[PDB]
Write a protein that holds these residues in place. Sequence first.
Motif, PDB file in Angstrom:
ATOM      1  N   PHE A   1       0.828  -1.199   0.000  1.00  0.00           N
ATOM      2  CA  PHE A   1       0.000   0.000   0.000  1.00  0.00           C
ATOM      3  C   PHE A   1       0.865   1.252   0.000  1.00  0.00           C
ATOM      4  O   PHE A   1       0.616   2.185  -0.774  1.00  0.00           O
ATOM      5  CB  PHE A   1      -0.960   0.004   1.193  1.00  0.00           C
TER       6      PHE A   1
ATOM      7  N   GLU B   1       3.750   1.571  -1.269  1.00  0.00           N
ATOM      8  CA  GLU B   1       4.052   1.615  -2.693  1.00  0.00           C
ATOM      9  C   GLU B   1       2.931   2.284  -3.473  1.00  0.00           C
ATOM     10  O   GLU B   1       3.172   3.201  -4.263  1.00  0.00           O
ATOM     11  CB  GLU B   1       4.285   0.201  -3.221  1.00  0.00           C
ATOM     12  N   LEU B   2       1.691   1.846  -3.240  1.00  0.00           N
ATOM     13  CA  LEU B   2       0.560   2.380  -3.994  1.00  0.00           C
ATOM     14  C   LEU B   2       0.471   3.896  -3.861  1.00  0.00           C
ATOM     15  O   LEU B   2       0.390   4.610  -4.864  1.00  0.00           O
ATOM     16  CB  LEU B   2      -0.735   1.712  -3.545  1.00  0.00           C
ATOM     17  N   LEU B   3       0.480   4.406  -2.631  1.00  0.00           N
ATOM     18  CA  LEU B   3       0.513   5.852  -2.426  1.00  0.00           C
ATOM     19  C   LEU B   3       1.582   6.502  -3.286  1.00  0.00           C
ATOM     20  O   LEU B   3       1.322   7.469  -4.012  1.00  0.00           O
ATOM     21  CB  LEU B   3       0.784   6.170  -0.964  1.00  0.00           C
ATOM     22  N   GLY B   4       2.801   5.986  -3.197  1.00  0.00           N
ATOM     23  CA  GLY B   4       3.849   6.523  -4.038  1.00  0.00           C
ATOM     24  C   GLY B   4       3.434   6.607  -5.491  1.00  0.00           C
ATOM     25  O   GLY B   4       3.353   7.701  -6.067  1.00  0.00           O
TER      26      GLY B   4
ATOM     27  N   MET C   1       0.828   6.645  -6.855  1.00  0.00           N
ATOM     28  CA  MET C   1      -0.194   7.655  -7.100  1.00  0.00           C
ATOM     29  C   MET C   1       0.425   9.037  -7.232  1.00  0.00           C
ATOM     30  O   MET C   1       0.120   9.773  -8.174  1.00  0.00           O
ATOM     31  CB  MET C   1      -1.238   7.645  -5.987  1.00  0.00           C
ATOM     32  N   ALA C   2       1.299   9.412  -6.297  1.00  0.00           N
ATOM     33  CA  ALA C   2       1.812  10.778  -6.297  1.00  0.00           C
ATOM     34  C   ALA C   2       2.878  11.011  -7.352  1.00  0.00           C
ATOM     35  O   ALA C   2       3.186  12.171  -7.661  1.00  0.00           O
ATOM     36  CB  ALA C   2       2.376  11.136  -4.924  1.00  0.00           C
ATOM     37  N   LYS C   3       3.449   9.943  -7.899  1.00  0.00           N
ATOM     38  CA  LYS C   3       4.478  10.047  -8.921  1.00  0.00           C
ATOM     39  C   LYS C   3       3.957   9.711 -10.316  1.00  0.00           C
ATOM     40  O   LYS C   3       4.323  10.376 -11.292  1.00  0.00           O
ATOM     41  CB  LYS C   3       5.659   9.127  -8.575  1.00  0.00           C
TER      42      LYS C   3
ATOM     43  N   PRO D   1       0.230   8.252 -11.703  1.00  0.00           N
ATOM     44  CA  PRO D   1      -1.032   7.599 -11.345  1.00  0.00           C
ATOM     45  C   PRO D   1      -1.433   6.486 -12.282  1.00  0.00           C
ATOM     46  O   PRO D   1      -2.003   5.490 -11.823  1.00  0.00           O
ATOM     47  CB  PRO D   1      -2.043   8.752 -11.376  1.00  0.00           C
ATOM     48  N   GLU D   2      -1.140   6.600 -13.573  1.00  0.00           N
ATOM     49  CA  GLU D   2      -1.662   5.599 -14.497  1.00  0.00           C
ATOM     50  C   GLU D   2      -1.030   4.242 -14.317  1.00  0.00           C
ATOM     51  O   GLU D   2      -1.415   3.299 -15.019  1.00  0.00           O
ATOM     52  CB  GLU D   2      -1.476   6.048 -15.945  1.00  0.00           C
TER      53      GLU D   2
ATOM     54  N   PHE E   1      -1.100   2.507 -11.454  1.00  0.00           N
ATOM     55  CA  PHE E   1      -1.673   1.797 -10.312  1.00  0.00           C
ATOM     56  C   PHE E   1      -2.218   0.399 -10.593  1.00  0.00           C
ATOM     57  O   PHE E   1      -2.146  -0.429  -9.670  1.00  0.00           O
ATOM     58  CB  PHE E   1      -2.777   2.646  -9.670  1.00  0.00           C
TER      59      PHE E   1
ATOM     60  N   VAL F   1      -2.424  -2.291  -7.435  1.00  0.00           N
ATOM     61  CA  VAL F   1      -3.664  -2.726  -6.798  1.00  0.00           C
ATOM     62  C   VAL F   1      -3.875  -4.207  -7.032  1.00  0.00           C
ATOM     63  O   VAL F   1      -4.507  -4.877  -6.214  1.00  0.00           O
ATOM     64  CB  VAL F   1      -4.895  -1.923  -7.262  1.00  0.00           C
TER      65      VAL F   1
END
Lengths: 31, 171, 68, 49, 75, 99
Positions: free
Chosen positions: E13, E15-18, E20-22, E24-25, E27, E31
């Motif tokens: 997760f 990782e996921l946040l990252g 997203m902020a770097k 987004p496409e 993800f 996920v």
Amino acid sequence: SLDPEIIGGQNNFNLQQIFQKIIQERGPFRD
Amino acid sequence: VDLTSIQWRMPEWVQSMGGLRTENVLEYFSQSPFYSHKSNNEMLKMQSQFNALDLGDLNSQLKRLTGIQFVIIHERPPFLWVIQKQNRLNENEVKPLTVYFVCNENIYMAPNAYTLLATRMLNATYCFQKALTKIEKFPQYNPQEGYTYPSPEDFSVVRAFMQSLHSSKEA
Amino acid sequence: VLEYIEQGRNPDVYARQFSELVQKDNQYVNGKLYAIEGFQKAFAEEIKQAYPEVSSVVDKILNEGKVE
Amino acid sequence: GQKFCFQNLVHVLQDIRYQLSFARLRNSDLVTALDILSTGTSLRLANAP
Amino acid sequence: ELRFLSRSLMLNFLELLGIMAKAPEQFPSKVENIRVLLLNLHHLINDYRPHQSRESLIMLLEKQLKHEESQVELL
Amino acid sequence: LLSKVPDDKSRFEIELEFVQMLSNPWYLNFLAQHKYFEDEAFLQYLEYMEYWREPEYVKFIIYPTCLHMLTLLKNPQFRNDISRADLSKQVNDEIYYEW
């Protein structure tokens, strides 16, 4: 396997209904 | 499928778009079995692909067009709208084929007076026939005794009881 | 635009709305990315104090997102 | 497209949470099962006036 | 193995946040990581249950016996 | 007297689902309004639903209520009162609370 187990709803906790039943099964009470 | 008895709405659709609008009333209508996909409004929707439009354009192009059209007859913003399935062969003259009802995010048939009053009468009739058919078998006729449906000493026994009872009650 | 000219509206209004929108959406997105940025940093520090044994891992996680 | 990305992620996360409720299994209500051995829902009757 | 999968999920997760902020496409990949981790967590907890249902039945049968012996002695 | 047109497997899928319907109180209310309880054939079909209490069969049924519902419906005064809307709401609320 499958062995029969005996349990009788011991976890769960009237004469008017009795009367009504007997009323339908032998009609009048008096007899 | 009988279209008149039924009551339809899609609150999921309304929430998806949001509030209940003029144009969203016509889209909502587009989702309903009442709307027909061969409609003229549907042919227009097919012709423009993701561009802005205007409403005066909508009526003025409805008349320009010839065929089956769904318009707003009366509009009340808070709760209810009024739509009709009018058919104009020529501009400025329209023959209304159906009327349609919108209320509290709900679409309804709003049917013809004849069918309403007729069905009412039919209900009443049915009640009558049923009641009379139940009664007619029951009563008995003997010609000396009369019509029948299937002593004072005993009456005095009762009087004795009721008086006993009144006595005990007063006590 | 053709629609605007059609209805007599000024096409310069369209140009205005779009440049304006470029700026607007710019700030909007940018700040969304920042919001998740801070969210991640908070989550990593909280993990670090909570689960110190994997601090190396989380630092390697931040370093793998970036460019060479 | 970037916004669509955010939203789309949220929807995927909801969807997998849904699959999650679909995958767990809960301890059996043996009580109701034993009552239904005897073909009544003893609970719903006793309880109800 | 459980604790491991869980701490692992935590990390994925992060990782996921990252991502997203770097970027987004990207993800969908991550996920997916998340999803398989949760589904495994559950499948395994499910492997735990049948014994739990059995022991709950045990405790129930024990209750019936207790009512039985107590009722016999009272009688 | 139209010739029967049933299917074997299909009618046990169906009779399962019908028992389920019987679990719903509102379905009982509509059923009573439609005066399906006036027909003796219906009541014999109810006793045919008694086959669904059997263990191999009841093993399939999903909503337990129906069984109870069925024994409830064996009293005819109950049938005329599930015609009533008030009692209907009483029954629904009674499940809702057990639930």
